[PDB]
C-alpha cells in the first residue's frame, strides 16, 4: 500500500512513552504504550472496580458506550510480577494514526495497584507476535498488515530525552527527521519475538559481559536496559553501582565518570555514554544517582534475556521490520 501513520508520544520522566488511540463508535481515546515487548492489546474496563487504584486513576473502555463493540468475553490474564492482570475479550474498532483497524483486545477488570498506579498511560498496545499473544489472539499490526495499506510492513521507535516531541511511533515505515546515517539490521533469532542475538556486553573498551553471546529482546515497553540479576551484578560491580532496593545508584559526582556501555548486535557496537545511562538529578557528592539498567530475570521462553528498552532506544532509533523478521537501528536525533 501507500499509507505511513505516526502517532505522537508524550515523554514522561524517560521511563514511559506514549501515544494515544481511540477505540469503538464514537472513539473512546486512551494514553497506551506501544511495546514490542508484548502481543495483545489492553485498556481498562468499565467492568472494573473503583476499589482498583489502577482503574480509579485511568481512562476506562466503556462498551455500552460503543455502537461498534462486538462481545467476546473470553477471559485472558497476564501473570504480571506483582500480581495478575486479567479480564475479557472484546472487539472493537482501534484508530491508531491515520489507521481503522478492527481489532480484539482485553478489557482490564483487575490489575495490581503497583505498577499500574503510576503508569501516566491507561493501557498498552503490544506490537509483538501472535506467537506471544495471550490467548492467541490476532496482534493488533497483524491486523494492520492484513489490511494492505502500509507503504512497508515495518514500524518505527523515536524516544526523546527528557524534555519538545517526547517521542514518535510511525506505521509503514520510519522517519529520516529523527535518525542519522542509515540503519543497521540484525535477523531476529526467530520469527515470534522481537529478540536478536547479542554477542557481548562491554564497560570501557573491554567486553566484560555475554562474551558467548545471549539474547537481546527489543522491548519498547520497557523502561530500562535490563539483564538478568547476574549479569547486572557484574555490570554493577565494572562501574562501581550501589544495590538498593529496586534499583542500582552511584554518587552523582561519579555520574559523568562511569565508563561507556557498549551493546554489540549484528555489525556494530551500539555504545551508551554515562549521560545516557544516568539519571543525573545532581553532580552532588552528598546525592545518590540512580542507573537507567536495572536487573530483571525474564522466565522461559523469552528469557533469560537482556532486555534493550528506552534507554537503549533514546540513542538508537529502531525499526521493526515484519517484513523481513529484522530489527534496524540508527542513531537517534
Ligand atoms: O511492565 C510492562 C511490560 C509489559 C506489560 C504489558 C502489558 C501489561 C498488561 C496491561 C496493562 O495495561 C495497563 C498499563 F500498562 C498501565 C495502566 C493501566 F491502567 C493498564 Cl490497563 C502489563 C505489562 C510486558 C513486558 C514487555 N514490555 C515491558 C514490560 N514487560 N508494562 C507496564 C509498565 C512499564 C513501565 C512503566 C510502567 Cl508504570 C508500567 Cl505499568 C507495559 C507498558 C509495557
Ligand atoms: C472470542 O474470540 C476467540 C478468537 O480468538 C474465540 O476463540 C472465541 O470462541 C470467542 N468467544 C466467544 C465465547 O464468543
New binding site residues.
Given amino acids: 500500500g501507500n499509507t505511513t501513520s505516526s502517532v505522537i508520544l508524550t515523554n514522561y520522566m524517560d521511563?514511559?512513552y506514549y501515544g494515544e488511540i481511540g477505540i469503538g463508535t464514537p472513539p473512546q481515546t486512551f494514553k497506551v504504550?506501544f511495546?514490542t515487548?508484548?502481543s495483545?492489546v489492553?485498556?481498562?474496563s468499565s467492568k472494573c472496580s473503583r476499589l482498583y487504584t489502577?482503574?480509579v486513576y485511568?481512562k476506562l473502555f466503556d462498551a455500552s458506550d460503543s455502537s461498534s463493540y462486538k462481545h467476546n468475553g473470553t477471559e485472558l490474564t497476564?501473570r504480571?510480577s506483582t500480581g495478575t492482570?486479567s479480564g475479557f475479550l472484546s472487539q472493537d474498532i482501534i484508530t491508531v494514526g491515520g489507521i481503522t483497524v478492527t481489532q480484539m483486545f482485553g478489557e482490564?477488570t483487575e490489575?495490581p495497584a503497583l505498577?499500574?498506579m503510576?503508569?501516566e498511560?491507561?493501557?498498552?498496545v503490544?506490537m509483538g507476535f501472535i506467537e506471544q499473544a495471550i490467548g492467541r489472539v490476532t496482534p493488533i499490526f497483524d491486523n494492520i498488515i492484513s489490511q494492505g495499506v502500509l507503504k512497508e510492513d515495518v514500524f518505527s521507535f523515536y524516544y526523546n530525552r527528557d524534555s519538545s516531541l517526547g517521542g514518535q511511533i510511525v506505521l509503514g515505515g520510519s522517519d529520516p527527521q529523527h535518525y542519522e546515517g542509515n540503519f543497521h539490521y540484525i535477523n531476529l533469532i526467530k520469527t515470534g519475538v522481537w529478540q536478536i542475538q547479542m554477542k557481548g556486553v562491554s564497560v570501557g573498551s573491554s567486553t566484560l559481559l555475554c562474551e558467548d553471546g545471549c539474547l537481546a529482546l527489543v522491548?519498547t515497553?520497557?523502561?530500562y536496559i535490563s539483564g538478568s540479576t547476574s549479569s547486572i551484578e557484574k555490570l554493577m560491580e565494572a562501574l562501581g553501582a550501589k544495590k538498593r532496593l529496586f534499583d542500582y545508584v552511584v554518587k552523582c559526582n561519579e555520574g559523568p565518570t562511569l565508563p561507556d556501555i557498549s551493546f554489540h548486535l549484528g555489525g556494530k557496537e551500539y555504545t551508551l555514554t554515562s549521560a545516557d545511562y544516568v539519571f543525573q538529578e545532581s553532580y552532588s557528592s552528598k546525592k545518590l544517582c540512580t542507573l537507567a539498567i536495572h536487573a530483571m530475570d525474564i522466565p522461559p521462553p523469552t528469557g533469560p534475556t537482556w532486555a534493550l528498552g528506552a534507554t537503549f532506544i533514546r540513542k538508537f532509533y529502531t525499526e521493526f521490520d515484519r517484513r523481513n523478521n529484522r530489527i534496524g537501528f540508527a542513531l537517534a536525533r
Fill in positions: 521511563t514511559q504504550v511495546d515487548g508484548s495483545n489492553w485498556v481498562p489502577a482503574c485511568h497476564l504480571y492482570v482490564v490489575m505498577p499500574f503510576l503508569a498511560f491507561d493501557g498498552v503490544g522491548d515497553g520497557a523502561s
